Scaffold this active site. Structure first.
Site, PDB file in Angstrom:
ATOM      1  N   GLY A   1     -11.257   3.155  10.369  1.00 53.27           N
ATOM      2  CA  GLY A   1     -12.409   3.420   9.522  1.00 53.27           C
ATOM      3  C   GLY A   1     -13.447   2.339   9.806  1.00 53.27           C
ATOM      4  O   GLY A   1     -13.087   1.230  10.207  1.00 53.27           O
TER       5      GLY A   1
ATOM      6  N   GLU B   1      -6.787  -8.338   4.749  1.00 52.80           N
ATOM      7  CA  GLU B   1      -6.850  -7.695   3.444  1.00 52.80           C
ATOM      8  C   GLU B   1      -5.577  -7.963   2.648  1.00 52.80           C
ATOM      9  O   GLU B   1      -5.616  -8.048   1.434  1.00 52.80           O
ATOM     10  CB  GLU B   1      -7.062  -6.189   3.613  1.00 52.80           C
ATOM     11  CG  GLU B   1      -8.419  -5.826   4.211  1.00 52.80           C
ATOM     12  CD  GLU B   1      -8.342  -4.658   5.180  1.00 52.80           C
ATOM     13  OE1 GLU B   1      -7.988  -4.879   6.365  1.00 52.80           O
ATOM     14  OE2 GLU B   1      -8.638  -3.521   4.756  1.00 52.80           O
TER      15      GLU B   1
ATOM     16  N   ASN C   1       0.873  -1.161   0.000  1.00 48.19           N
ATOM     17  CA  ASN C   1       0.000   0.000   0.000  1.00 48.19           C
ATOM     18  C   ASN C   1       0.917   1.220   0.000  1.00 48.19           C
ATOM     19  O   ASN C   1       1.499   1.573   1.031  1.00 48.19           O
ATOM     20  CB  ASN C   1      -0.930  -0.006   1.215  1.00 48.19           C
ATOM     21  CG  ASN C   1      -1.909   1.165   1.213  1.00 48.19           C
ATOM     22  OD1 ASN C   1      -2.016   1.900   0.229  1.00 48.19           O
ATOM     23  ND2 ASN C   1      -2.628   1.339   2.319  1.00 48.19           N
TER      24      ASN C   1
ATOM     25  N   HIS D   1     -13.533  -0.265   1.924  1.00 44.99           N
ATOM     26  CA  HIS D   1     -13.253  -1.506   2.652  1.00 44.99           C
ATOM     27  C   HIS D   1     -13.640  -2.733   1.822  1.00 44.99           C
ATOM     28  O   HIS D   1     -13.865  -3.812   2.369  1.00 44.99           O
ATOM     29  CB  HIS D   1     -14.021  -1.561   3.982  1.00 44.99           C
ATOM     30  CG  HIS D   1     -13.440  -0.697   5.058  1.00 44.99           C
ATOM     31  ND1 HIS D   1     -14.201  -0.194   6.093  1.00 44.99           N
ATOM     32  CD2 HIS D   1     -12.175  -0.261   5.273  1.00 44.99           C
ATOM     33  CE1 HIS D   1     -13.431   0.522   6.894  1.00 44.99           C
ATOM     34  NE2 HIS D   1     -12.197   0.498   6.420  1.00 44.99           N
TER      35      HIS D   1
ATOM     36  N   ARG E   1      -2.567  -2.268  -3.379  1.00 45.35           N
ATOM     37  CA  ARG E   1      -3.842  -1.713  -2.960  1.00 45.35           C
ATOM     38  C   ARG E   1      -4.055  -0.417  -3.720  1.00 45.35           C
ATOM     39  O   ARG E   1      -3.132   0.392  -3.848  1.00 45.35           O
ATOM     40  CB  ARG E   1      -3.832  -1.428  -1.456  1.00 45.35           C
ATOM     41  CG  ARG E   1      -5.188  -1.005  -0.899  1.00 45.35           C
ATOM     42  CD  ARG E   1      -5.121  -0.879   0.628  1.00 45.35           C
ATOM     43  NE  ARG E   1      -6.449  -0.908   1.225  1.00 45.35           N
ATOM     44  CZ  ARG E   1      -6.897  -1.899   1.991  1.00 45.35           C
ATOM     45  NH1 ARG E   1      -6.112  -2.933   2.272  1.00 45.35           N
ATOM     46  NH2 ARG E   1      -8.123  -1.850   2.492  1.00 45.35           N
TER      47      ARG E   1
ATOM     48  N   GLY F   1     -10.271  -4.114  13.459  1.00 38.66           N
ATOM     49  CA  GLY F   1      -9.586  -3.985  14.740  1.00 38.66           C
ATOM     50  C   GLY F   1     -10.526  -3.940  15.936  1.00 38.66           C
ATOM     51  O   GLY F   1     -10.268  -4.552  16.979  1.00 38.66           O
TER      52      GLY F   1
ATOM     53  N   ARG G   1     -13.704  10.440  11.769  1.00 38.88           N
ATOM     54  CA  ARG G   1     -14.661  10.811  10.717  1.00 38.88           C
ATOM     55  C   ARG G   1     -16.107  10.791  11.209  1.00 38.88           C
ATOM     56  O   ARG G   1     -16.515   9.877  11.924  1.00 38.88           O
ATOM     57  CB  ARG G   1     -14.536   9.870   9.515  1.00 38.88           C
ATOM     58  CG  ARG G   1     -13.224   9.991   8.757  1.00 38.88           C
ATOM     59  CD  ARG G   1     -13.060   8.862   7.772  1.00 38.88           C
ATOM     60  NE  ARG G   1     -12.013   7.936   8.192  1.00 38.88           N
ATOM     61  CZ  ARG G   1     -11.713   6.806   7.559  1.00 38.88           C
ATOM     62  NH1 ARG G   1     -12.383   6.454   6.472  1.00 38.88           N
ATOM     63  NH2 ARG G   1     -10.743   6.027   8.015  1.00 38.88           N
TER      64      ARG G   1
ATOM     65  N   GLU H   1     -13.122  -7.277  15.826  1.00 43.22           N
ATOM     66  CA  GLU H   1     -12.492  -8.539  16.217  1.00 43.22           C
ATOM     67  C   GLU H   1     -12.183  -8.629  17.709  1.00 43.22           C
ATOM     68  O   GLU H   1     -12.124  -9.722  18.270  1.00 43.22           O
ATOM     69  CB  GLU H   1     -11.199  -8.763  15.415  1.00 43.22           C
ATOM     70  CG  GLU H   1     -11.438  -9.021  13.924  1.00 43.22           C
ATOM     71  CD  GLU H   1     -10.179  -8.836  13.068  1.00 43.22           C
ATOM     72  OE1 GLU H   1      -9.059  -9.127  13.549  1.00 43.22           O
ATOM     73  OE2 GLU H   1     -10.310  -8.392  11.910  1.00 43.22           O
ATOM     74  N   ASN H   2     -11.989  -7.480  18.343  1.00 37.90           N
ATOM     75  CA  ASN H   2     -11.356  -7.434  19.656  1.00 37.90           C
ATOM     76  C   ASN H   2     -12.179  -6.812  20.780  1.00 37.90           C
ATOM     77  O   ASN H   2     -11.968  -7.131  21.947  1.00 37.90           O
ATOM     78  CB  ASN H   2     -10.015  -6.708  19.543  1.00 37.90           C
ATOM     79  CG  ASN H   2      -9.040  -7.451  18.653  1.00 37.90           C
ATOM     80  OD1 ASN H   2      -8.699  -8.598  18.931  1.00 37.90           O
ATOM     81  ND2 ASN H   2      -8.605  -6.809  17.568  1.00 37.90           N
TER      82      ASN H   2
ATOM     83  N   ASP I   1      -9.139   6.723  19.562  1.00 38.43           N
ATOM     84  CA  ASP I   1      -8.860   5.290  19.704  1.00 38.43           C
ATOM     85  C   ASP I   1      -9.946   4.613  20.548  1.00 38.43           C
ATOM     86  O   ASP I   1     -10.104   4.927  21.722  1.00 38.43           O
ATOM     87  CB  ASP I   1      -7.476   5.102  20.342  1.00 38.43           C
ATOM     88  CG  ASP I   1      -7.108   3.637  20.548  1.00 38.43           C
ATOM     89  OD1 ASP I   1      -7.971   2.748  20.399  1.00 38.43           O
ATOM     90  OD2 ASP I   1      -5.936   3.379  20.877  1.00 38.43           O
TER      91      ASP I   1
ATOM     92  N   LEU J   1     -15.356  -2.849  11.676  1.00 39.43           N
ATOM     93  CA  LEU J   1     -15.169  -1.750  12.624  1.00 39.43           C
ATOM     94  C   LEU J   1     -13.692  -1.685  12.989  1.00 39.43           C
ATOM     95  O   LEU J   1     -13.161  -2.615  13.584  1.00 39.43           O
ATOM     96  CB  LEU J   1     -16.038  -1.968  13.880  1.00 39.43           C
ATOM     97  CG  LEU J   1     -17.504  -2.334  13.606  1.00 39.43           C
ATOM     98  CD1 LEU J   1     -18.270  -2.661  14.903  1.00 39.43           C
ATOM     99  CD2 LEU J   1     -18.220  -1.218  12.844  1.00 39.43           C
ATOM    100  N   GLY J   2     -13.020  -0.620  12.558  1.00 37.05           N
ATOM    101  CA  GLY J   2     -11.628  -0.373  12.918  1.00 37.05           C
ATOM    102  C   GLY J   2     -11.428   1.132  12.989  1.00 37.05           C
ATOM    103  O   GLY J   2     -12.321   1.854  13.435  1.00 37.05           O
TER     104      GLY J   2
END
Lengths: 384, 384
Positions: free
Chosen positions: B204, B372, B8, B174, B85, B322, B233, B325-326, B274, B201-202
């Site tokens: 972005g 990805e 990327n 995404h 990418r 991110g 955002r 998953e967590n 964050d 969900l991360g």
């Protein structure tokens, strides 16, 4: 015998109605349009229709002609108050209020929030003070009903200071319609309070989730531009379009915003703002008209689906507004898109626009006529 | 045994990975940062982390260092292709493509859609043509997966000319994560392709409705600014905010857009971008962090609800990214808000982010890790 003069003042139009709050009867309705043009005219509908032309008539001329009519037909003596539709009451108003120095100051402050609406409302109020000096006046706000929306729903995800110092958040509109129609729904369903989704579809379109009689979420935003597809308004759109259009085409924010409000919606998609004309064109095979109907109907379906989140048990999905009350083809389209959520139309009931139009295996689907003018008359009577 | 180099290439950074498409193993990953500045550095993560500083190293210096590392560690000989990418492929690309003069022209035509990224993508490709001349190259677009969205869903309600001449419509993003994750869901769920809603969900955040393996609707818009609440955002907002801020505070389109992209979302609401820190603050009792989580979670729930229209039978709601998953607390909050739609979480399964985290009486709710870089490697392998 008391009557309320109900007004909806627009940039170049004044819609009026004379309503008896005790009988709920509308004695006279009318509309001045094309004000400040050579095509200015005032239509009066009482026992019979009368159209009065006034080339180059100003807003003041219109009000003087309205007064003349009321005097000549012996209504003036019966009028006890004037109720005004005001689109935006910002965070100031969660119910209707008497017009006086304080409320007028607040309505004026809300011009910033609804710059395309509040100036004309205020002009109307001022003409009435001058022309009907001894009458009490009431403002009924299309944002008031939605003031019950909680912060986590109404606020945008933007800096605290913009939200709080500058009052930027979702306010909604069509509140008077949504209030009237949801109360009517509860009456028909014999409930104390309504748990309904109300789709007000007309020149402007919005949809609202009403839980236990109170608005919990609604589709219009800071202003009536946001949400559903409308006659000339875009509704929902990626805010990125501003930078994109500005950088590439050089349009100003004012020009982009005007385009979203005046050249978008059905008009932008297919070249016609009137859903009746769009339906007729689509029926004849016009591809863009057919597409406009799909985009319009699909967005309504998406909002109805999203608002299901609020209901353990949904009492009804309710259609109202010029389109919602009269367009069987549009109701059928929207409902077909909601098949997966357990909505199903009875075609015969739909074709006749009955109070209930759902089939047996479906959530209730209702058609209820809105009557914003009567609601305004009642709100007004309450305060005098 | 062959390997794909996945890149990327940004304006001041190169993210890279060396992946074996057949074993699915990531052998090395890395990131060059602050290119052409005093603080230029390249991180390499294989068996251990190594950080190599290169004060004022050129973008070309970065690539030679990357090449050197691949030579020194005997990777270069095993590399069969390079996958890039590309954030935006407009309506030109509905799938990955080998890089040649033709596809490069098309990518260049998409610059206006991603003016800060597509140029860096192109330059990176050119560096690779110089430095790894023997290798075939493939472009994988964040927008390609969503190119199955039909027009009545993707188009906005705006003037025909803006839609078509100027290519203004919903593209989403995404795409590579939504594709990879829905592919993984298909391996787990039934014999057919997946019928799933994927919430990525991360930093972005976006959500996609996938029907029989194909994207039918998604939450991002023209750019990755629109839709869900994110770290910095705003996501969805009334377009009217531009005229309001411009007219009342005097900001430029650029300043307003920067605010929505960089000072909004969780950061705007509560002061922290964050989600981990937001959660920790909320857990100590900070009411604004709590509000940020309510606004964030409710918006995800509203999109999930709205996407239910597409499914006769929903296979699963899938969390990824991110946060997805967590963050067990965030998933719990979102599912809590979906109670009226037949979603219920199992707390112990949720606590370990298991493949299925729903309780007995519920739609399936899943957690699937996105990858990805692997997807880009697989797309690339497919074309060589």
């Amino acid at each position: 015998m008391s009557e309320i003069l109900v007004l909806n003042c627009g940039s170049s139009s004044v819609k009026f109605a004379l309503i008896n709050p005790h009988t709920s009867q509308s004695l006279v309705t009318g509309l001045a349009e094309n004000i400040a043009t050579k095509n200015c005219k005032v239509v009066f509908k009482a026992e019979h229709k009368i159209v009065k032309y006034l080339e180059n008539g100003s807003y003041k001329d219109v009000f003087e002609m309205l007064k003349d009519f009321l005097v000549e037909n012996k209504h003036l003596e019966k009028i006890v108050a004037i109720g005004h539709r005001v689109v935006h009451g910002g965070q100031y108003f969660s119910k209707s209020v008497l017009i006086n120095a304080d409320s007028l100051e607040k309505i004026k402050a809300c011009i910033a929030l609804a710059p395309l609406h509040n100036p004309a409302h205020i002009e109307g109020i001022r003409f009435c003070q001058q022309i009907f000096p001894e009458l009490p006046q009431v403002a009924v706000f299309d944002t008031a009903f939605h003031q019950t929306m909680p912060s986590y729903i109404a606020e945008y995800a933007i800096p605290y200071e913009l939200t709080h110092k500058h009052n930027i958040r979702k306010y909604g509109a069509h509140g008077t319609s949504h209030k009237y129609v949801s109360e009517q729904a509860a009456k028909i369903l014999t409930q104390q309070k309504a748990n309904v989704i109300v789709a007000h579809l007309g020149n402007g379109c919005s949809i609202t989730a009403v839980v236990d009689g109170k608005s919990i979420d609604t589709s219009m935003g800071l202003t009536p531009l946001d949400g559903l597809v409308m006659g000339t308004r875009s509704g929902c759109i990626d805010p990125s379009i501003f930078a994109y259009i500005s950088d590439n085409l050089g349009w100003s924010v004012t020009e982009i915003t005007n385009m979203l409000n005046k050249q978008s919606g059905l008009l932008g998609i297919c070249g016609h703002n009137d859903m009746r004309e769009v339906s007729q064109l689509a029926a004849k095979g016009d591809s863009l008209a057919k597409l406009a109907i799909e985009i319009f109907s699909h967005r309504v379906a998406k909002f109805v689906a999203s608002y299901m989140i609020y209901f353990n048990k949904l009492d009804a999905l309710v259609f109202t507004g010029g389109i919602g009350e009269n367009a069987a083809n549009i109701r059928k389209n929207i409902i077909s898109k909601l098949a997966n959520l357990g909505f199903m139309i009875d075609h015969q009931k739909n074709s006749n626009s009955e109070t209930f139009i759902n089939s047996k295996n479906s959530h209730n689907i209702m058609v209820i006529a809105t009557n914003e003018e009567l609601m305004i008359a009642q709100e007004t009577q309450n305060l005098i």
